Design a protein around this ligand. Structure first.
Ligand SMILES: [Mg+2]
Ligand SMILES: [Mg+2]
Ligand SMILES: [Mg+2]
Length: 106
RNA sequence: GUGCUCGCUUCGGCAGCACAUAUACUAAAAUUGGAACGAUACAGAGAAGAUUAGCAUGGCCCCUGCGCAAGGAUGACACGCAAAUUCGUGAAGCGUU
């Protein structure tokens, strides 16, 4: 059982260290980024997860499920306007992926 | 500061002229922080039984070396509920239109 936010920050320190270490070794391996971003979105620290998805798109911009997870985080967390920007950037960079257009018009 | 001054003009002072033209991380300091690989306790070599030569791979880990040699335990690390977009069959019971 964790008490006041010193111990919560210690938990977060351990988890962030674990994920950043997995990112250091694998470097690519897109699931590592997705797990770390899902963990950040579960704790409503979604600016961290914006950073993680943007770093993952710096690694691999052509991976379509990564764009999908980033945009579904921003849709899910009621950030209509961020997600809308993401879909515009997604359909601009990867225009022959029809997934992006269907989900944005939906 | 020196010298020339047919300068006042004594050998005292002054006047003019010429030449000479810009050092310094400005400290004898006040401060300000970070390191060592030594002890002192816990700790003990990778490869699916045991004993083990090693050569790599990658980087927000470096050390010895002049080294684009070669060593450092194969120098160490690496050991992970390793789940990424995206579903459907058939029968039975209950309630509903
Ligand atoms: Mg060697
Ligand atoms: Mg050996
Ligand atoms: Mg090695």
């Amino acid at each position: 059982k964790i008490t006041d936010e010193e111990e919560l920050n210690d938990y977060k320190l351990r988890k962030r260290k674990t994920f950043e270490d997995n990112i250091r070794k694998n470097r690519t391996v897109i699931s590592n980024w997705i797990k770390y971003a899902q963990w950040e979105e579960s704790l409503k620290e979604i600016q961290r997860a914006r950073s993680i998805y943007e770093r993952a798109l710096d690694v691999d911009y052509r991976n379509i499920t990564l764009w999908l997870k980033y945009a579904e985080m921003e849709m899910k967390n009621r950030q209509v306007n961020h997600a809308r920007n993401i879909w515009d950037r997604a359909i601009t960079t990867l225009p022959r992926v029809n997934q992006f257009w269907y989900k944005y018009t939906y």
